[PDB]
Amino acid sequence: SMSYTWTGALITPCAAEESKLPINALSNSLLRHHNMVYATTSRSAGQRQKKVTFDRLQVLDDHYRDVLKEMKAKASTVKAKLLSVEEACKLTPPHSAKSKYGYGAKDVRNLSSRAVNHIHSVWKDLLEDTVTPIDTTIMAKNEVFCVQRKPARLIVFPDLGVRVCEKMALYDVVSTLPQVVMGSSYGFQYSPGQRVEFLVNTWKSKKNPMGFSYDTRCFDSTVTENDIRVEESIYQCCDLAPEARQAIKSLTERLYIGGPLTNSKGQNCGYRRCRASGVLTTSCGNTLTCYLKASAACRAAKLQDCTMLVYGDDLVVICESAGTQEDAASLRVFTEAMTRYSAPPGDPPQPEYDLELITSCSSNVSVAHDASGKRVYYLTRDPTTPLARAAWETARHTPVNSWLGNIIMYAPTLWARMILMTHFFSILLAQEQLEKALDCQIYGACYSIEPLDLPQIIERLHGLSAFSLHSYSPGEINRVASCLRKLGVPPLRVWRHRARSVRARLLSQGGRAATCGKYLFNWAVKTKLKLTPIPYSGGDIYHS
Numbered sequence: 177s178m179s180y181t182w183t184g185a186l187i188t189p190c191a192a193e194e195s196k197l198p199i200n201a202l203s204n205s206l207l208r209h210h211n212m213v214y215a216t217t218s219r220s221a222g223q224r225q226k227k228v229t230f231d232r233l234q235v236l237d238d239h240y241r242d243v244l245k246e247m248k249a250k251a252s253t254v255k256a257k258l259l260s261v262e263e264a265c266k267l268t269p270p271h272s273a274k275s276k277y278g279y280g281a282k283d284v285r286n287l288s289s290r291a292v293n294h295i296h297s298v299w300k301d302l303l304e305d306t307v308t309p310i311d312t313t314i315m316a317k318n319e320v321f322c323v324q325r326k327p328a329r330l331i332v333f334p335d336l337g338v339r340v341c342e343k344m345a346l347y348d349v350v351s352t353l354p355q356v357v358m359g360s361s362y363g364f365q366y367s368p369g370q371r372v373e374f375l376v377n378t379w380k381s382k383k384n385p386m387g388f389s390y391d392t393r394c395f396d397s398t399v400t401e402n403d404i405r406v407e408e409s410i411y412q413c414c415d416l417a418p419e420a421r422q423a424i425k426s427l428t429e430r431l432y433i434g435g436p437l438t439n440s441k442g443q444n445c446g447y448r449r450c451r452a453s454g455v456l457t458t459s460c461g462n463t464l465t466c467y468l469k470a471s472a473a474c475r476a477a478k479l480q481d482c483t484m485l486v487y488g489d490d491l492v493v494i495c496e497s498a499g500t501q502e503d504a505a506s507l508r509v510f511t512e513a514m515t516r517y518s519a520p521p522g523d524p525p526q527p528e529y530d531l532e533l534i535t536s537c538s539s540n541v542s543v544a545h546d547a548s549g550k551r552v553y554y555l556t557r558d559p560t561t562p563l564a565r566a567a568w569e570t571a572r573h574t575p576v577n578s579w580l581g582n583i584i585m586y587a588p589t590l591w592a593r594m595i596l597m598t599h600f601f602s603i604l605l606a607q608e609q610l611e612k613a614l615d616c617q618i619y620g621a622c623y624s625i626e627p628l629d630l631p632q633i634i635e636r637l638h639g640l641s642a643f644s645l646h647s648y649s650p651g652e653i654n655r656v657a658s659c660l661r662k663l664g665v666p667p668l669r670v671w672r673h674r675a676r677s678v679r680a681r682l683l684s685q686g687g688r689a690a691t692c693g694k695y696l697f698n699w700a701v702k703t704k705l706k707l708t709p710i711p712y713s714g715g716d717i718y719h720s
């Protein structure tokens with residue numbers, strides 16, 4: 177079965193699209209090499225269409241069925257509830273795409289009679305009809321990168337009314353089932369500090385640890401009808417209301433397995449027979465499907481004492497080494513098994529014998545030291561894309577503020593602290609916008625967050641140590657320094673000078689502002705203060 181069929185109609189935009197980095201009076205203070213930063217547009221959609229369109233073959237063996245039976249046995253212990261229309265509505269983001277039938281996201285959130293009436297009719301239709309394919313819109317995503325250019329990724333999503341109905345049927349399922357089925361292997365359950373702790377203790381639990389990342393090429397396209405039906409059979413193991421069972425069956429048959437693709441102008445672009453990236457079950461589905469295939473592939477490879485970590489289509493296995501040559505042999509068998517299950521790799525997997533050399537979800541573990549001199553592990557990444565996006569966001573207001581998301585999730589890193597915090601707090605000070613809530617996206621969920629609350633948020637996610645880390649590793653410092661030279665960002669010495677000023681300015685304002693000065697910028701001062709404590713990817717999900 178081909179992942180997609182195409183009619184020839186183009187994937188069209190719904191608004192003007194910029195590819196070139198916008199420049200304002202603040203741009204050069206962050207980044208000088210402007211031509212290295214670009215945004216993707218619908219003009220490259222055709223190139224992506226070629227990449228994501230291919231034939232899938234699946235061969236399923238006993239290892240696959242054995243693991244599935246185990247997953248279903250765990251799923252059988254889960255009890256999930258239907259959300260009411262009101263509850264589902266409150267989970268709808270304020271800036272979620274409006275319905276084709278005369279209401280928007282704010283009408284949903286307000287429980288307006290028109291929006292509520294349509295939702296009730298869509299739900300009734302799901303209960304009454306389990307066959308008619310549901311329409312979807314296909315769009316090119318506009319995302320920002322540094323050169324070496326990527327073609328635009330594609331998003332596929334149904335109408336707002338359907339999206340609310342997905343929440344009613346499945347929000348409690350996708351929120352509760354994966355952790356029960358996959359246990360400690362389900363990566364979404366951890367804060368950044370908990371995840372790094374899990375990874376470290378997992379590495380030390382093995383006598384001779386070996387680990388590897390495995391990244392599938394265009395995972396969404398490798399997901400077959402079988403895969404999506406097997407996912408449904410897992411959901412249906414739950415203790416559910418009969419009305420929920422029918423809605424889940426209907427959504428699977430009419431939406432999740434496949435459907436027609438329509439562009440922004442209303443033309444049929446073709447047909448999908450693989451994972452839709454903009455449905456509620458995308459994250460949960462990919463995570464279950466990746467975990468199933470990978471667990472079965474570990475058994476085929478005879479890998480000893482495996483601990484897996486899975487987040488969507490991102491996979492890491494840490495296991496007991498059988499020797500360097502034996503380990504390398506077993507990874508080939510793994511890849512062969514994964515390939516028979518439809519999930520061949522982008523690059524072949526590599527065994528690693530140092531935890532810090534495994535990269536996954538674009539991240540790796542590194543080490544720094546706290547105020548006492550004790551080693552502290554933390555998750556970091558190559559800062560090139562965060563910084564390119566920060567540059568765009570310096571001159572353009574965007575729907576999601578990646579800089580804010582990055583400060584929160586990478587708070588302990590030397591690049592988030594020295595550059596992102598310093599740059600954006602300076603901007604916020606100048607416009608007196610410290611108290612203004614901003615949208616950012618964490619694990620695919622949209623959150624509205626006031627910058628003034630960052631200290632409390634960072635402590636809870638990473639611990640108090642995130643405000644006093646020092647003596648970073650030579651490898652991490654060198655990667656950061658090299659990235660700055662590459663993009664024409666000023667060197668770290670300049671950012672320390674700027675941070676002193678930004679800190680002084682925050683202290684001057686007092687209150688929560690001064691708390692941001694004290695905690696976020698203690699690294700900048702020569703004589704430190706002793707810091708005490710402070711008193712659904714594509715799923716269309718929102719939280720306060």
Ligand SMILES: CNC(=O)c1c(-c2ccc(F)cc2)oc2cc(N(Cc3cc(F)c4c(c3)COB4O)S(C)(=O)=O)c(C3CC3)cc12
Nearest residue numbers: 363368487490492534536537539540555585617618619620
């Ligand atoms: C690969 N599997 C894992 O679970 C992860 C490893 C990893 C595992 C094993 C290794 F050996 C090395 C790294 O490192 C990780 C780092 C993160 N973070 C970064 C991050 C990545 C993202 F894609 C997103 C977000 C954050 C927010 O919203 B996004 O969807 S972090 C520092 O916030 O914790 C995550 C996040 C998304 C859950 C997972 C892993």
